[PDB]
Amino acid sequence: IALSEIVSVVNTSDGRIEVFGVGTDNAVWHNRQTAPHSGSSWTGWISLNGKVTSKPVVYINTDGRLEVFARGTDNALWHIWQTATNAGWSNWQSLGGTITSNPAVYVNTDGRIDVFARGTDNALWHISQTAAHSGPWSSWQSLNGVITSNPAVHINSDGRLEVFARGTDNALWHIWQTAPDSNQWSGWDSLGGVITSDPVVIGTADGRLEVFARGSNNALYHIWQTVPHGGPWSNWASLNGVITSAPAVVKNSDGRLEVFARGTNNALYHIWQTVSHSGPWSNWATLNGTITSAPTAVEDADGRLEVFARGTDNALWNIWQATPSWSAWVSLKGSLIDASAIK
Amino acid sequence: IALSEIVSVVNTSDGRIEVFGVGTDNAVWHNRQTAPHSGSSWTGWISLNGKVTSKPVVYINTDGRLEVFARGTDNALWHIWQTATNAGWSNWQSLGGTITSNPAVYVNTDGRIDVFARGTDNALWHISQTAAHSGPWSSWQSLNGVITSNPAVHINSDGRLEVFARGTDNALWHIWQTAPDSNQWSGWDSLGGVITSDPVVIGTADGRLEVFARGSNNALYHIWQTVPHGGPWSNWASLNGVITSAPAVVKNSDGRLEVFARGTNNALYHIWQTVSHSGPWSNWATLNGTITSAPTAVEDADGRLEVFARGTDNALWNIWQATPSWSAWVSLKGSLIDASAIK
Ligand SMILES: CO[C@@H]1O[C@@H](C)[C@@H](O)[C@@H](O)[C@@H]1O
Ligand SMILES: CO[C@@H]1O[C@@H](C)[C@@H](O)[C@@H](O)[C@@H]1O
Ligand SMILES: CO[C@@H]1O[C@@H](C)[C@@H](O)[C@@H](O)[C@@H]1O
Ligand SMILES: CO[C@@H]1O[C@@H](C)[C@@H](O)[C@@H](O)[C@@H]1O
Ligand SMILES: CO[C@@H]1O[C@@H](C)[C@@H](O)[C@@H](O)[C@@H]1O
Ligand SMILES: CO[C@@H]1O[C@@H](C)[C@@H](O)[C@@H](O)[C@@H]1O
Ligand SMILES: CO[C@@H]1O[C@@H](C)[C@@H](O)[C@@H](O)[C@@H]1O
């Protein structure tokens, strides 16, 4: 697997970016913008404690409360959650299980967080809240398959969760709810190709899933639903380049997709749709830096992309999107590790 | 009450704007962009039939299905829904009650649509889906108060619904859920002022409610939460102008608020936050035309504002936020009436 993202990031319900990563102590730490604008100062790193053995994944409940999922030292899924929106945190609590990947997390149309992770059998498993933004949690449940990457999940424009992963043949595979909120899932299906990164999935401005992944020649590839929330999918297409990390995809404030990834000189590169969403793609361009993780990208409250990546000093660095050139690479300090359960 | 909005507008799950209005036959008609882009052509007007006696209000269920609420000729609340996302429509069905205002509609954090309408006692009443995006519906319940305008609803950044309506003293009042999804609401709180239009409410880029209304001198006023999802509120602040309709507010793609209203010469006027969201407001500027309703504004899938208003020929007209100085007005044809239950 190509080098992973090292933080999970969200724009919170009060328009501040909040970033979560794993320290050299194997605890989860978070850092938050003090103001809801590009170029804001940062709180600085605060520990949520714990001892984790995967990438932490943050998700926002439908009531705005942040919730973090990660594998623990006992290999169970653990979580920790804000007890009120943007306020204080609970203690860490186990959700049991024994998992062998990073979690992937999404919310159902009924407000129930659904968490996906690989099992000891190498199947995809899932567990979910039984009520909107609320425990108790369900029991684990298998979705079978046998997968060789961390999973990625997104919602279709008809409300059906759909999960993506690399299979034993190194192809992109997927599986989907048969109906919104449903514990009844489809059978596994294959989209072919050969991929050398975790896949990353996004919903387009016109309601279609689009999936990006590094290919066997280390170029960036993508593939998409041809109609909203349905098949057929397209043929694989190449966006070229050569990337030395997992790709990260985000939607600009005007709908245009943009993808970020480490280049072969360890600098950050990006490529974007031009003209409009679903428009033709640009040439790759550099944003400089020397980075030691995959980048992570998010839209801030001013409608600008912000990217995060670990530096040569093992600190987290940040850069954001401005008219002619981007911002400075700015250090948020800290000392992060790649705790990804599959590397 | 100042002259109302004539259509209800929504972004569909496949990135097209869809507008809903009442025809000269008192049936609900709709028109949809053919393409998810600014300046797209339109399907043309299609009837949903029925016979309504309020402004119709569309809302998108969390599974992507559109649903329209309107008062019927029997003064009850009626609704009609898509049977599949962006597909065919149900028959009209009654939710009963007797209502004396336009409905206001919002979704709870648990995916259950809540509908609010003034009752025969001039209290605010509500009815909701009992499950996520699904019937059956609840019994009617009173949220008390005595109100003299149409209600407006939005969700807080902590997931609590909040409703605004003018009171018997002509002040802006409000009530809120004590917790997300709850049927337990607060008492009516006065935010004072004297308002001469329905209030409009929006959520800011940093998670605060902000309310706009015409005041006693026909100026535009606004008031806001000073902290995300909490009090205290600011004082009322004038945005000046002299407006001859209800105002409509929308958020740009970069978070800046922009308000639209009819001026004294019956043209469309607007005013916007400059620099960034929550920044200082512009001067009023005209967008020309001659309109016979309040405008309705929405962001399209390219991140551009689109405004709709009835024209002198009773057709619906459109203008959108093109680079230099906005598009030309284009007619979408049709023949619309103002069916608002309170005028
Ligand atoms: C809070 O508890 C600590 O962190 C959790 C995430 C688990 O790894 C547990 O075994 C460890 O003791
Ligand atoms: C269902 O098929 C099994 O699981 C898929 C996810 C792939 O790994 C495939 O090659 C494997 O045999
Ligand atoms: C712009 O700065 C460059 O890239 C950062 C991400 C850091 O690795 C730093 O040490 C390096 O000089
Ligand atoms: C389909 O039913 C028609 O429209 C409804 C919205 C009601 O006004 C009803 O009385 C009328 O007959
Ligand atoms: C269900 O209750 C009925 O409808 C409500 C909306 C109110 O108008 C009430 O006075 C009336 O009795
Ligand atoms: C709760 O109090 C009732 O409702 C408010 C909205 C006001 O109209 C007030 O005059 C009335 O007595
Ligand atoms: C731009 O055109 C002007 O405004 C439109 C909204 C229509 O009312 C039209 O008749 C009028 O002349």
Numbering used by the authors:
A (entry chain B), B (entry chain A): 29 to 371
Paper text:
In this article, we studied five members of the PLL lectin family from P. laumondii subsp. laumondii TT01 (PLL, PLL2, PLL3, PLL4, PLL5, collectively referred to as PLLs). All studied lectins belong to the seven-bladed β-propeller structural family. Each blade makes a W-motif composed of four antiparallel beta-strands (β1-β4) connected by β-turns and loops. The saccharide binding sites are located between the adjacent blades and are uniquely organized in two separate circles around the monomer.
The PLL chain A blade W1 interacts with chain B blade W3, whereas in the case of PLL2, PLL4 and PLL5, chain A blade W1 interacts with chain B blade W5. The highest affinity was seen towards methyl-α-l-fucoside (αMeFuc), ranging from 0.4 ± 0.02 mM for PLL2 to 4.9 ± 0.08 mM for PLL4. l-fucose was also significantly recognized. In this study, we confirmed that PLL2 highly increased ROS production and discovered that other PLLs also activate a similar oxidative response, suggesting that the immune systems of both humans and insects recognise all these lectins. In human blood activated by zymosan A, PLL2 and PLL3 inhibited ROS production, suggesting these lectins interfere with the innate immune system reaction in the early stages of the Photorhabdus infection. Different behaviour was seen for d-galactose, which inhibited only the binding of PLL3 and not PLL2, despite confirmed binding to both proteins from ITC, suggesting that d-galactose aims for different binding sites than MGMR in PLL2.
